[PDB]
Amino acid sequence: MILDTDYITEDGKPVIRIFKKENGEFKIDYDRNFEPYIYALLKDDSAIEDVKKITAERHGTTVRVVRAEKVKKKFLGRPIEVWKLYFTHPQDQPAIRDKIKEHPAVVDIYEYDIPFAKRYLIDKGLIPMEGDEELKMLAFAIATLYHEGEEFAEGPILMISYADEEGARVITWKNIDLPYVDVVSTEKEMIKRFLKVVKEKDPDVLITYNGDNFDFAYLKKRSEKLGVKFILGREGSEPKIQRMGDRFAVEVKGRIHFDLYPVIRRTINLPTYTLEAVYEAIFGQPKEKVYAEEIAQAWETGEGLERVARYSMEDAKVTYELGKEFFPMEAQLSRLVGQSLWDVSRSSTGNLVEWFLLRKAYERNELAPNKPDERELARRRESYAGGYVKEPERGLWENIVYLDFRSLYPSIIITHNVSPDTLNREGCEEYDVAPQVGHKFCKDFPGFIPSLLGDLLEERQKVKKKMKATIDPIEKKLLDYRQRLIKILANSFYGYYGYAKARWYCKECAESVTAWGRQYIETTIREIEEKFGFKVLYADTDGFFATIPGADAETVKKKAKEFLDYINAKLPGLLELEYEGFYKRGFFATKKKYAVIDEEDKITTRGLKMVRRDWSEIAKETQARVLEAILKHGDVEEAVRIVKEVTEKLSKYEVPPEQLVIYQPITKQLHDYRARGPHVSVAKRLAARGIVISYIVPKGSGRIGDRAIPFDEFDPAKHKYDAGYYIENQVLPAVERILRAFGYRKEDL
Ligand SMILES: [Ca+2]
Ligand SMILES: [Ca+2]
Ligand SMILES: [Ca+2]
Ligand SMILES: [Ca+2]
């Protein structure tokens, strides 16, 4: 299979290198016959002789046009004739493209900013990560000596850890009594030892967590300081560093540097992206953090080195575990888009669609529009109206069905042929008009994007049915990832339409999709109300919650299935409404805030879940008790009494102080925490003396931080906690947000 492609220069000529892994053997294929090129639209074919003679200069070397050929391609639906201009080297393109554009007889130029190695994969029809070849993976992490007022990598690397199927090991230059620790004499020997491990293991994938902006940069400065040839590449090369905007990225030639940090940054949404928080959210298992101060203190005193070595080991271990969880999904995404895993894993949603479209455009002989210039880019700060959100009929409801459209936005694009090449196209005999915005779309021929989107949805169905018949559980997982990734890519076409940097950007297309979406969701709602007598409790963009308040659970289900048969016969094209699920009870607080419970007793909450550690146990316990009384018992007046009971126990000081302790970690220098937080205030009082902050809020005057004390110093016989604080700032805010819709103000409890 193909891992990646790049180019080297030989006698001023580009040579493509294709890195492959066939039958467990690494191979490099060379191609010296791929010519870089750009298109040029001319107003007169006679002008081609003037364009051929246009010259530029890179660094003394004269840039010339190698050869030209007239080709017929499609552009905005219409057939067009452009000149394919070939060059000697891909770096000739940025040097001469401006001189060719400025020529009077040149209307415009196209496909002039496509990286050579990526242009090769598309033009040759090559797809990376294709097949069932097994890649060998290796994760690694480093521990460093940090001091407050020092430059980057001024301190040495203390430990280098690595992990794979054989387990996790730590290389260090100090004696540590642990079975997984390998001891060397110096930092130089530790680095050299790590090089030998990578060379002997010969992994296809190197997995890091933030290796793009820390690990490789630290290793580089250290190898320069110690005189070590950091040959990580399979061709004997040192890691290549690139600039990605305001940040960096690192390639390792012959292998795939898989940095988990940008991948997880897009996949899940978390408050922080530390390795500890990420691992705990994905695997649900805790991971202890050992700070730079503790590491430095342990290394200088030689005391708790086992704790440091164990932290180092866990870093490599969890990085390998996370890499095993996210890499197969990103590998299938790379195969789908048609680009290397290195680029795909570092590209955002907008670029992924663009690369997919660029490959398809070449296959369909479709000339790709250019990126917007700075002037046009500033003009594309255009916003528009989004999805429809119904104001919910607040309160507790019984026997609720959730109905939603199968791929609403892609269905609209296909059905109404929404595309920049069909937008206001004159000369057609059939059009579809978008409500409110009024944009017209030609229906005479399939548009470029709707046509590809139709093939994607069709391809996904071919994968779904092959999964049912696939005996092999590993192959079923592979197909499952591809199927899921097609759904993700198909649902990204809409956002791409409103993406200002997009080649196929079209605000008219984007707002037409949302306008049609608002129409279909609203028409379906009034249809179920008027012709089936349902009450629509709440709706958001592509689905709604409905019920018959005076009907049986089986009666609601039956009527819902009958409604589905009815509207699906009336919906045009690919639009389709589906039965998502049935819920025994449901509480709808405000727009975007609600909670439902199924027949199994599983509760789904969207809004103020409050599963955080920076909130007292008393507040979290009461909230759970309230939700249970509402969703399991359907007793609203019981949920109220529970809050009244808790506030009465808090006011009479009958609640144990252990369920009032708040735990908060110090992650930065005390001078940098100028938020006057209670945990920081407690920490500053500790630092004021000679020598996770666990504190309780006591009864007194001043700010919360002025009252707060560590729980170790709290004594029920000498001190009194702030009953008012735990009622008004902890319990009531957490519960009021749920009971709010009933009209139960804070003073009602
Ligand atoms: Ca590449
Ligand atoms: Ca659905
Ligand atoms: Ca088709
Ligand atoms: Ca239909």
Author numbering: 1 to 691, 698 to 755
Give the exact sentences the study uses for this entry.
To better understand how the mutations added on TgoT variants impact the structure of the polymerase, the X-ray structures of the apo form of TgoT, replicative polymerase TgoT_6G12, and reverse transcriptase TgoT_RT521 were solved by crystallography. Crystals were obtained for the three polymerases and diffracted at 2.4, 3.1, and 2.35 Å, respectively. Comparison of TgoT_6G12 with TgoT_RT521 structures shows a strong similarity between the two polymerases (r.m.s. deviation for Cα atoms: 0.6 Å). On the contrary, larger rigid-body movements in the palm domains (r.m.s. deviation for Cα atoms: 2.7 Å for TgoT_RT521 and 2.3 Å for TgoT_6G12) were observed. However, very large rigid-body movements can be locally seen between the thumb subdomain of TgoT and those of TgoT_6G12 and TgoT_RT521.
Archaeal DNA polymerases from the B-family (polB) have found essential applications in biotechnology. Variants of the archaeal polymerase from Thermococcus gorgonarius, TgoT, that can either generate HNA from DNA (TgoT_6G12) or DNA from HNA (TgoT_RT521) have been previously identified. In this study, six X-ray structures of DNA and HNA polymerases are reported: (i) three apo- structures of TgoT, TgoT_6G12, and TgoT_RT521-; (ii) two DNA-bound structures of TgoT_6G12 in binary and ternary complexes; and (iii) one DNA-bound structure of TgoT_6G12, which has incorporated two HNA nucleotides. Consistent with all other DNAPs from B-family, TgoT and its variants fold into five distinct structural subdomains.
